[PDB]
Ligand binder design. Structure first.
Ligand SMILES: Nc1ncnc2c1ncn2[C@@H]1O[C@H](C[C@H](CC[C@@H]([NH3+])C(=O)O)[NH2+]CCCO)[C@@H](O)[C@H]1O
Ligand SMILES: [Zn+2]
Ligand SMILES: [Zn+2]
Ligand SMILES: [Zn+2]
Length: 243
């Protein structure tokens, strides 16, 4: 039939917003109605189980000697409060929104245009040793978990955001992604964040190469929709020249 501009429709009860992730009561109410994802413990930093030469004034921009090595500045930075290279410490996350996708579950989208190499969010979670990781892999498999939330931090430490983390846990995989992980040193401690790799326009889903699953043994259908989607996610090996 002929289509027309719909009338204005205000909702019957009040809608769910990103601040409601810091309001357990309202999140749990919204979640019951399918307007928010399942509850998890929102954390501000991971749970465990260098002075630049910039002249005091963009403060600590692209030429900052700390930034170039993926090291954040300290409070002692020559630019003090105005230092732009304390993004993890100041939780200077991008304007993001959580979305419900047709096939992948929940996801994240950009609420403003994000330039290339913009910090999106820290990937926070429980930092697991190999023993605990192996125990949880078996636990989650037996429980038939639909989604996975592991990310390697270093060779002996894996971050698990299944139970505790932030909205970065909702990031989906794409075969042609628009974000990547970067591992930054913040007061001597390695942390991992998502950063854009191109200009991401407002309203676009934020995606990454989910290496943990991509190079794992088992596979699943990939719903990324990208022009050159590899078809499935998992069961892949990195390039090697054998024998
Ligand atoms: N292209 C794709 N095709 C099929 N399935 C996909 C998918 N991209 C994501 N998935 C599903 O999401 C899981 C990953 C979760 C997000 C989970 C989120 N969607 C949710 O609903 O909670 N983030 C991991 C953060 C780093 O550890 C993943 O394992 C797969 O199940
Ligand atoms: Zn600097
Ligand atoms: Zn600085
Ligand atoms: Zn794909």
């Amino acid at each position: 039939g002929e289509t027309s501009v719909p009338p204005g429709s205000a909702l019957v009860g009040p809608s769910c917003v990103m601040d409601d992730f810091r309001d357990p009561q309202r999140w749990k109410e919204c979640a019951k109605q399918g307007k928010m994802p399942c509850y998890f413990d929102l954390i501000e930093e991971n749970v465990y189980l260098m002075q630049c030469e910039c002249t005091p004034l963009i403060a600590c921009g692209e030429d900052c000697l700390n930034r170039l090595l993926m090291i954040e500045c300290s409070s002692r930075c020559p630019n003090g409060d105005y230092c732009s290279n304390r993004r993890f410490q100041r939780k200077q996350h991008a304007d993001v929104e959580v979305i419900l996708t047709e096939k992948k579950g929940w996801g994240l989208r950009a609420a403003k245009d994000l330039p290339s190499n913009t910090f999106v969010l820290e990937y926070c979670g429980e930092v697991l040793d190999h023993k605990e990781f192996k125990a949880r892999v078996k636990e989650y498999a037996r429980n038939k978990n639909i989604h996975y939330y592991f990310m390697a931090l270093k060779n002996d430490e894996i971050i698990d955001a299944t139970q505790k983390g932030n909205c970065s846990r909702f990031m989906n995989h794409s075969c042609e992604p628009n974000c990547e992980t970067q591992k930054w040193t913040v007061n001597g401690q390695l942390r991992v964040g998502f950063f854009t790799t191109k200009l991401v326009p407002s309203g676009s889903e934020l995606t990454f190469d989910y290496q943990f699953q991509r190079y794992g043994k088992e596979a699943q259908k990939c719903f990324c929709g990208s022009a050159n989607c590899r078809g499935y996610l998992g069961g892949e090996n990195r390039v090697s020249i054998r024998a």
